[PDB]
Amino acid sequence: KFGWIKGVLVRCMLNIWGVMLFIRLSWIVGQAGIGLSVLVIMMATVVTTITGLSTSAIATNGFVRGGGAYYLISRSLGPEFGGAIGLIFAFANAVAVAMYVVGFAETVVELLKEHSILMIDEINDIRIIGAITVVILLGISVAGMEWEAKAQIVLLVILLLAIGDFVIGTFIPLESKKPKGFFGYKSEIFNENFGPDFREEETFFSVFAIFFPAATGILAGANISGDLADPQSAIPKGTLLAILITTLVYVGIAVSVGSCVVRDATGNVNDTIVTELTNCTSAACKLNFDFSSCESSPCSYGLMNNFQVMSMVSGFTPLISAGIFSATLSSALASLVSAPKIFQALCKDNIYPAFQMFAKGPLRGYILTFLIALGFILIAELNVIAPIISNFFLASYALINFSVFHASLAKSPGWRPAFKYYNMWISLLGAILCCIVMFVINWWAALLTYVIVLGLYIYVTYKKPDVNWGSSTQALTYLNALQHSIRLSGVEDHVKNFRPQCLVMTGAPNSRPALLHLVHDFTKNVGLMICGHVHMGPRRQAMKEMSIDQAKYQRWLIKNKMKAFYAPVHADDLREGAQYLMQAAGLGRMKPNTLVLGFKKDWLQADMRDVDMYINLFHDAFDIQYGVVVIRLGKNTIDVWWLFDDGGLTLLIPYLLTTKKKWKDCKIRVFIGGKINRIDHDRRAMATLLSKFIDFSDIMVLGDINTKPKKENIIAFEEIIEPYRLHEDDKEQDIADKMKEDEPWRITDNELELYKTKTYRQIRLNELLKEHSSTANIIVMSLPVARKGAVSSALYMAWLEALSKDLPPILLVRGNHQS
Amino acid sequence: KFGWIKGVLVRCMLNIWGVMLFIRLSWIVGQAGIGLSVLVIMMATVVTTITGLSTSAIATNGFVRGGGAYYLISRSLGPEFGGAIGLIFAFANAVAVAMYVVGFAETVVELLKEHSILMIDEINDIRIIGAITVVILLGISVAGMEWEAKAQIVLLVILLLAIGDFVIGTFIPLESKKPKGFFGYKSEIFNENFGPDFREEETFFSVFAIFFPAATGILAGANISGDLADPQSAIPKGTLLAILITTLVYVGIAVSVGSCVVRDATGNVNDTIVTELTNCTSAACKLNFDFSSCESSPCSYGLMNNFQVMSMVSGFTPLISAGIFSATLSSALASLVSAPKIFQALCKDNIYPAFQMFAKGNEPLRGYILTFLIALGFILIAELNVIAPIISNFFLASYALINFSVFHASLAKSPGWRPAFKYYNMWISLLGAILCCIVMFVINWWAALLTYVIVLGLYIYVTYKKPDVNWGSSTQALTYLNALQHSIRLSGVEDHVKNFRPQCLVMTGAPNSRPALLHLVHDFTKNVGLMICGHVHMGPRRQAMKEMSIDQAKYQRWLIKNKMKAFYAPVHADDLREGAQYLMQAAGLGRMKPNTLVLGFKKDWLQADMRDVDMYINLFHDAFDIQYGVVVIRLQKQGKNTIDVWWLFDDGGLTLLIPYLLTTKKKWKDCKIRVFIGGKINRIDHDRRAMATLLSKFRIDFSDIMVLGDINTKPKKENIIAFEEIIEPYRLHEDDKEQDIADKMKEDEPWRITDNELELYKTKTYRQIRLNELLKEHSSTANIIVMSLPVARKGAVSSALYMAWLEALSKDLPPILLVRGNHQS
Ligand SMILES: [Cl-]
Ligand SMILES: [Cl-]
Ligand SMILES: [K+]
Ligand SMILES: [K+]
């Protein structure tokens, strides 16, 4: 709504123009020459303008919401890059507050000192002034924000008036100021000052580090507003014009003041000499006064001895002092307002669990910024505070540049910048340049910040995959999931690599959570697991019914650490819903390949037409070549049994179960029955086969299964199966037919006589399980197959019941006959 | 075929004991004290033992077939980490060859200088001898490959005997050597030597950096060999015993030579202090053979000045000379045979395509040449104190990489990555990686910065830029798990906002006959949404699975070749409607489920059997019941002419959303969106301003908007007549025919166009015809025309009539789209 001139340009100029303009720029152009100071300014401008290009490319995506720098970085790029940059930038602003207020306090200290007033000491006076100013600025930061927009332009015009006052006063040389080194545009002085004169321990990159804060603040200005009209258009123009204007002004002032004042001089109005020109080495040869003592012994005034040379050279000192005040305070306030906001946004997004508290809306953010600022203000020296802010802001800018380059390098799903002059290789160059300069200024601090950065990046990317942590950009999650699924579909598995992709169908999802938990146990990071539910009734209400049920069951599953996808369906009967889930559900390679059906607990009482369709589900699944699993219900062991191996799924499942922590204590015992003569050969061959795939200790072989079982179990079988026996032998054929055609689902007696052997052997198998595997936590066998049409459903399920009569947890697993 | 001792212990120990045991360790205990030199040794041992634990953890996994170091790291861990580590380690070994050869040259030139023979200079003589010896080592690397294993134990026993000779000689002081500063185990010497004395500008980490390559060589002993039986058990025990033995010998030798020789001496037996005692302050107060004069000026003998103290204190010097030759040559040969193999294996794996020349066989024709040139270039720097730091740098880089790779793979368990080795703790490995990194920055911060810049560049290039690199390993499990994780993340959070992406199910109904429909459907679902194709299988089930799998394979490879991002979803059913219902109701994994339907226009509905048309109308009705958006497409133009859309009602913004998505694509950018509404003539201005607001809020540009109120006008006679002949074949003729026969015919063919329906909906037909005429007149130039799909309640309308309306609206027109959202915002 603001526009761009009042929304970015003004904000960026007031954030950029800070302490260094009117305090250390003279000192910097004194230490180094005009040439290397201009090179310093150009280096800073190059770093800031490359970062400006990267930011403009960031801000031209369609994600234009919220209104905060961290918001743009997080929503356009990954959450982890967003979090890292947000935290580091928040800290950088928290310390920049201290820098600006310390500069202001130093100015007030000197201003009082030149007068009669004074306090206990310079350093302690700086501490007191900085603390009180920080208190006042924070107090303003939460109340007077309704006036900052009005006062913004006033501050900028006052700052510009101060710059104009300095430049105008430059052109008016006076004899009063001449002792202090202010001569005025003399080619001898320009020649003297053009060369480096690093006097104290400082070097090139020390002055570069002390100056860089003169160019930091491009993001802090406008991007954090994000409430502009057409943010896709305000930011790229505003930032890239603010940078140009500020750099031009900096270079102009540097060259001018370097060409206007001599390196060091004293305030002695005497010392004027015209007597001799013996040496006249100094650039003050016109007079030369007696600055030889100044260069040989300590002297107060000069270019380097005192930093407020701009105050003296100016025509009017109150105006330039007001300029310094405004330049420091505006940027201090901007930083102290932009740090807690990022802290609060980070807390709300809850990227870092330690920072999960927002103080009920953001006392935590203000308290952190205040404590960091006050802690650093206790250092009352500015040439030692400037480098650490330089390091933190180079860290932020390097991270932004590399993040943009990386999001472009990997064709990220939601990275279409739509900007001109944004080549990603330039961004990579900016990143490496920032890192190298960070290291050259101070290698160990750069190392420390970068290990912190890498730790944060890895921690966020990997150690937090669970809930997405309040990410409003669930659209980016959708895009990433779509890309992942597309990539998986593209990858064609010539070898199927059969993984457990279950389709668990039970009816009421919450009736038997035990089956779901057991399925969870062997479906951890190995394959898919889709629930199922067929909903009967009119479609009009059913639409709302599944609309609610999908949500309710999916988050009920999620809260149980369940990787469950709910797949509700509407059908005229259970079999139709089974078919719908069976043939359609599953995208690309995530196609379910196993059907896990919950066993009927009380089929005795329920009408057995339902039994018929529940059993026909087995044939329907088999006809499509689905592995069939049926379930019925650490301290003990496990038992695995089978009569055949078709794909090894029956053997593979317990291996998957044991690998988990809960079942780690449990152990698998092999339980089979083979030829009595070939017990040793079969045992050795199967032990070798298992070893080829899985440790084992014992292999029980029960080759006696062929003979008839005990009388009691057989009897119980007949008193189980009698009610639906055809009675074809007992009744008359034609008389029986009147029941057969209208009741064709009766237990086929002819099958009973034909399948006596199957009944006997399966009953004996159940018995042997009873004696042997009673103590096992869970038992596993191969699910018997009854051919369609040849065998009635009722007989098959009677066989199943006899197989699973009064036993601990029991599973029946048959593979799909595919390797 | 080797076992613990001869397979790992011998190789690791004879690789570890290299050049600095007998050349620089005396000088190291000189520069530092006993305490600080022992601290240096312990720090190097800590770094190397943490790396040994991590290497053991890598080597204890099941991947045991190939038998190679780089093979091992690459197969157990990611291909990107494998490639980075392989390249860095190959370079490190190539430089280590130069180091060991330089040590050999220095020792031999010193020996010759002991005699009359002397080339131009020590430095130049080292240069020449390094050249000849490295070429000889290159020759014997390939020529003498068969019998090296026999000389293995010969060299090891010679080295052991050399150490024994040194330690025995330590216990027999001789008068003739005492001038050279060699006493025997004197307490004052020990007390003097416990404190640091850094003569040159070198500091603690300078001597540490020089010393470190005395502790490196653990990997190349056994991991590179590979072909040793039971490696999973041999490698850990063998390497972690070699480290212990060698470190114990290093501490013993350091403390023994630091407590037995004075820092600086002179080979003159004159001016003993026992005659005249001034202060006796020096630690050599016992004799003080005029060593006080050696403080002012350096001396040719002593513990600091002489780099062959181990050859002086020892008993029989030639044995120690032979020991030095043996250790240096053995380590040099091990490095020179390990490097080319890594280069060749890496190039064969094709991780970095630029290195193509080296892939040539069977032996690498160019890899040996590359390592020979690197070694020959580096040995030209005669000084060894200036070669050691860079080998230290590269080996520290490799060890940090191994430790961090193992830690990361432990943090990201997605691959198999089962260690099975106790003492695997990933926190210890991380600590080792950090220690290596910071210690390597403490030495040549800029060299280490360059090394990490290059390492990160290699890693990023291999992992993200490369579409896929699985030539050796084909786990393909990370993709599955990441896709599953993203799917659950998407399906987990409940968002009240609809988030109405366009999710389209397209049922072409043909095997591959209709590609451009797929292309157009993909244009507006390329990154915004999801696209699922359709295919229904007619026939018996028993042959269905194989045929449909083959069809899926061919169409998927075609889509990959067609650069299509879509999913093939086959289904088996009796008829098309059944398959369509199967796909609509039970397709979609979580939130990635279709919410709109795309159907191909029936070109030959007139000629085709009416049963198909009735089924197709039933398919529309089924889609409507489920509340999905319906898009009917019929027709290749990309940028020739503008795009026109003529919607009369808004249903969730789909009518306006689809054209925007189409325009956003690069190949449609050359066209312009133009709306064409037919509304009240009196309220043209209101309609225009409202639609301008609508487009602005939905972010669409409009060339010009015109409102027409002529829809209500009766259509011209010729169009009505033409529609009459179009509908005549299916006319019911209920009024014209008798009631009884008409009802019988209706019972036989209930889909016949009811005359009552035509009479009732005559207004609908007339408005449709007028709309068709207006579209033909106005939007003829535009390549593609989009408008609302006509719809009526089922039963009250005939399938023939509905299809006739659709045909009329899409008669002799450019690309035509009829869109109707699911009535949801
Ligand atoms: Cl500033
Ligand atoms: Cl060595
Ligand atoms: K600033
Ligand atoms: K070594």
DSSP annotation of B278 reads S
Joined tokens for residue B326: 């043996």
Q: Which has the closest alpha carbon to B526: A413, A233, A594?
A: A413
Q: What is chain A's Cα-based Rg?
A: 41
**Alpha carbon of B215 to ligand 4 centroid (Å):** 6
Distance between CA atoms of residues B48 and B213, nearest Å: 11
Q: Which residues surround ligand 4, an ion (CB under 5 A)?
A: B 18, 217
Q: How far is CA A223 from CA A154, A292, A341, B226, in A?
A: 21, 52, 13, 57
Closest to A558 (Cβ–Cβ): which among B445, B479, B492?
Answer: B492
Are B773 and B715 spatial neighbours (Cβ–Cβ below 8 Å)? yes
Partner-chain residue, chosen from B480, B493, B529, that has the shortest CB–CB distance to A468: B493
Instruction: Quote the minimal CA–CA distance from B187 to chain A in Å.
Output: 41
- Structure-block tokens of residue A143: 């109340």
Judge: B565–A486 Cβ closer than 8 Å, yes or no: yes
Most B CBs within 10 A among A439, A576, A583, A818, hence the mutation to make, goes to A583
Q: Which method was it determined by?
A: cryo-EM
- CA distances in angstroms from A531 to A586, A594, B569, listed in the order given: 12, 12, 20
Pick the ligand that lies closest to the CA of residue B16. 4
In B508-628, at which residue ranges do the beta strands (DSSP E only) sit? 530-532, 535-537, 570-572, 596-600
User: CA-to-CA distance for B767 and B713, rounded, in angstroms?
Assistant: 8
C-alpha B250 to ligand 4 mean position (Å): 12
CA–centroid distance, B237 to ligand 4, in Å, is 19
CB A372 within 8 Å of CB A91: yes
Contact A169, A257 (CB under 8 A): no
Instruction: Quote the tokens at residue A161.
Output: 């008036």
Cα of A184 vs centre of ligand 3, distance in Å, is: 29
Q: DSSP 3-state assignment of B706? A: strand
Ligand 3 centroid, distance to A216 Cα (angstroms): 5
Cβ count within 10 A of residue B669? 11
Strand B535-537 vs strand B503-507: parallel, antiparallel, or unpaired? unpaired
Angle at A183 between CA A180 and CA A187, to 5 degrees: 135
In chain A, residues preceding a discontinuity (C to N beyond 2.5 A) are: 361, 633, 693
* Residues of chain B with C-beta less than 8 angstroms from the C-beta of A523: none
Residue with tokens 């078709």: A646
Q: Are B674 and B702 in contact (CB under 8 A)?
A: yes
Which residues does a gap of C–N over 2.5 Å follow in chain B?
A: 361, 635
Taking the C-alpha atoms of residue B572 and residue A583, their distance in angstroms, rounded to an integer, is 7
Rounded to whole angstroms, the maximal C-alpha distance in chain A is 152
B44 closest CA partner among B224, B307, B243: B243
List all residues 6 or more positions away from A142 whose beta carbon is below 8 Å from its beta carbon: A366
User: What is the distance between the alpha carbons of residues A419 and A439, in angstroms, rounded to a whole number?
Assistant: 31
- Write the secondary structure of B192-231 as one string of H (helix), E (strand) and C (coil): HHCCCCCCCCCCHHHHHHHHHHHCCCHHHHHCCCCCCCCH
DSSP A663: T
HSE value, Cβ hemisphere, 13 Å, CA-based, for B424: 18
Which helix H or strand E contains A272, and what residues bound it? Answer: none
* CA A33/CA A348 separation, integer angstroms: 49
The rounded radius of gyration (Å) of the Cα atoms in chain B is 43
CB contacts of A570 in chain B (<8 Å) are 585
Judge whether A216 and A389 are in contact, CB under 8 Å: yes
- Of the residues B453, B493, B698, the best mutation for testing chain A's interface (the one with the most A CB atoms within 10 Å of its CB) is B493
CB A793 within 8 A of CB A764: no
| B387: DSSP letter | T
Of B486, B557, B586, the CB nearest to A580: B586
User: Distance from B196 to chain A by nearest Cα, in Å?
Assistant: 25
Tell me which residue in B484, B586, B588 faces A528 most closely, judged by beta carbons.
B484
Classify each residue of B299-310 as buried b or exposed e, where b means 16 or more C-beta atoms within 10 Å of its C-beta: bebbbbbbbbbb
Query: Which of A484, A622, A656, A788 is the mutation pick for testing B, counting most B CBs within 10 A?
Result: A484
Place of tokens 């095997």: B511
Mode of pairing for the β-strands spanning A810-814 and A779-781: parallel
Q: Which residue has the tokens 């430095």?
A: B123
The answer to whether B325 is annotated as binding is no
The CA distance from B566 to B507, in Å, is 13
Using an 8 Å Cβ cutoff, are A522 and A653 in contact?
yes
Cβ contacts of residue B784 below 8 Å, gap of 6+?
Answer: B637, B643, B644, B662, B814, B815, B816, B817
The per-residue DSSP string of B344-380 comes to HHHHHHTSSTT--GGG-----TTHHHHHHHHHHHHHT
Cβ-in-10-Å burial (0-12, 13-18, 19+) of A81 comes to buried
A212 Cα to the center of ligand 1, angstroms: 8
Distance CA B753, CA B796 (A): 11
Which distant-in-sequence residues (6+ apart) come within 8 Å of A218 by Cβ?
A12, A15, A16, A48, A51, A52, A55, A239, A242, A243
In this structure, the number of other CB atoms found within 10 A of the CB of residue A660 comes to 14
Phi, psi of B360 (to 5 degrees): -65, 145
Are B235 and B8 spatial neighbours (Cβ–Cβ below 8 Å)? yes
Strand order of the β-sheet with A502-505 is: A529-530, A502-505, A594-598, A627-632, A810-814, A779-781, A638-641, A668-672, A699-701
How many CA atoms lie within 13 Å of B153's alpha carbon, on the beta-carbon side? 5
Q: Do A587 and B569 touch (CB under 8 A)?
A: yes
H/E element holding B104? helix B79-114
In CATH, what number does A8-463 get? 1.20.1740.10
Residue A109 structure tokens: 């200290």
Q: Do the annotations mark residue B429 as ligand-binding?
A: no
Q: Where are the beta strands (DSSP E) in A337-467?
A: none
Determine the 3-state secondary structure of B508 from DSSP. Answer: coil
Interior/surface letters B222-259, b for 16+ CB within 10 angstroms, e for the rest: bbbbbebeebeebbbebbbbbbeebbebbbebbbbbbb
Residue B302 labeled ligand binder: no
Which position has the token pair 């309220």? B683
Distances (CA, A) of A522 to A430, A511, A516, A660, B419: 49, 20, 10, 8, 21
Taking an 8 Å cut-off on Cβ atoms, the answer to whether A563 and B484 are in contact is yes
Coil, helix or strand for A186? coil
According to the annotation, is B539 in a ligand binding site?
no
- Residue whose tokens read 């003539």: B681
Q: Which residues from B are below 8 Å from A593, CB to CB? A: none
Burial class (CB in 10 A: 0-12, 13-18, 19+), B609: exposed
In 3-state terms, what secondary structure has residue A533? strand
Report whether A453 contacts A88 (CB < 8 A).
yes
By DSSP bridging, strand A810-814 and strand B629-634 are unpaired
**How do B570-572 and B535-537 pair as beta strands?**
parallel
List, as ranges, residues with CB under 5 A of the ion ligand 2: B 18-20, 214
B157 burial level (CB within 10 Å; 0-12, 13-18, 19+): exposed
Hey, is A513 helix, strand or coil? helix
Contacts of A463 in chain B (CB under 8 A): 411
Residue to mutate among B417, B445, B484, B535, with most A CBs inside 10 A, is: B484
* 3-class DSSP state of B531: strand
User: What is the DSSP annotation of A745-787?
Assistant: TSB-HHHHHHTHHHHHHHHHHHHHHHHHTTSSS-EEEPPP---
Identify whether the C-beta of residue A811 lies closer than 8 Å to the C-beta of residue A618.
Answer: no
Helix or strand (DSSP H, E) at A32: none
Residue A289 falls in which region: left (phi positive, over 0), alpha (psi -120 to 50) or beta: left
Reported CATH class of domain B8-465:
mainly alpha
Residues of chain A contacting B625 with CB distance shorter than 8 Å: 539
Q: Nearest Cα to A413, choosing from B628, B337, B490, B275? A: B490
Q: What angle do CA A430, A432, A436 make, to 5 degrees?
A: 115
Shortest alpha-carbon distance between residue A793 and chain B (Å) = 22
Picking from B527, B586, B627, the nearest residue to A584 by CB comes out as B586
Cβ pair B51, B210 in contact under 8 A: no
Q: Sort residue A806 into left (φ over 0), alpha (ψ -120 to 50) or beta.
A: left
Please give the C-alpha separations between residue A706 and each of A534, A700, A755, A765, B704, in angstroms, as whole numbers. Answer: 42, 16, 14, 10, 88
Let me know: does A58 contact A404? Beta carbons within 8 Å. Answer: yes
Q: Which residues contact A111 (CB under 8 A, 6 or more apart)?
A: A321
Structural tokens at position B368: 């040996």
Which DSSP symbol is given to A306?
Answer: -
Residue in A414, A478, A492 nearest the CB of B553: A492
CA distance B193 to B259: 7
Q: What is the DSSP letter of A412?
A: -
Contact A485 B589 (CB under 8 A): yes
Backbone φ and ψ of B673, nearest 5°: -80, 125
Rounded distance from Cα B12 to ligand 4 centre (Å): 10
The whole-angstrom separation of Cα B167 and Cα B182 is 13
The reply to whether residue B483 touches residue A482, judged by beta carbons under 8 angstroms, is no
The answer to whether the annotation marks A94 as part of a ligand binding site is no
Q: Which residue in B has a C-alpha nearest to residue A552's C-alpha?
A: B494
- Out of B464, B483, B560, name the one closest to residue A409 (CB): B464
Smallest CA–CA separation between B483 and chain A, in Å?
Answer: 5
Residue A251, φ and ψ in degrees, nearest 5: -65, -40
The token duo for A367 is 């308290």
Q: A597 by DSSP, 3-state: which? A: strand
- Say how far apart CA A210 and CA A25 lie, in whole Å: 10
Mutate which of B589, B666, B697 to disrupt the A interface (most A C-beta within 10 Å)? Answer: B589
How far apart are alpha carbons B620 and B596 in whole angstroms? 11
C-alpha span between A121 and A380 (Å, rounded): 11
Number of Cβ within 10 Å of residue A600's Cβ equals 18
3-state helix, strand, coil in chain B (%, to 5): 55, 5, 35
Length in residues, chain A? 819
Q: If you write DSSP's letter for every residue of A557-589 in order, what string do you get?
A: HHHTT---B--EEE-SSHHHHHHHHHHT---TT
How many Å separate Cα B740 from the centre of its chain?
78
Note the Cα B230 to chain centre separation in Å.
31
Identify whether the C-beta of residue A804 lies closer than 8 Å to the C-beta of residue A767. no
Distances (CA, A) of A447 to A398, B88, B437, B448, B697: 14, 21, 9, 11, 48
Q: How far apart are CA B769 and CA B723, in angstroms?
A: 9
What does DSSP say about strands A638-641 and A568-570: parallel, antiparallel, or unpaired?
A: unpaired
The encoded tokens of residue A683 equal 């045992």
**Whether A770 contacts A807, CB under 8 Å:** yes
Lateral strand order in the sheet of B629-634: B530-532, B503-507, B596-600, B629-634, B816-820, B784-788, B643-646, B673-677, B706-707
How many residues comprise chain B? 825
Ligand nearest to the CA of B18: 2
Chain B residues with CB-CB distance to A468 below 8 A: 489, 492-493
CA of A162 to the centre of ligand 1 (A): 16
Residue B20 known to bind ligand: yes
The H-assigned helical ranges of B586-681 are: 610-625, 654-664
Q: Which ligand is nearest to the CA of B250?
A: 2
Nearest Cα neighbor of B504 from B527, B529, B535, B536 is B529
Q: Which of A640, A650, A652 is nearest to A776 (CA)?
A: A640
B314 carries a ligand binding annotation: no
| B568 has binding-site annotation | no
Contacts of B157 (CB under 8 A, 6+ apart): none
CB contact under 8 A, A563 and B408: no
Beta bridge partners of A699: A670
CA A170-A176-A180 angle, to 5 degrees, is 70
Q: Which residue is it, tokens 């406008």?
A: A222
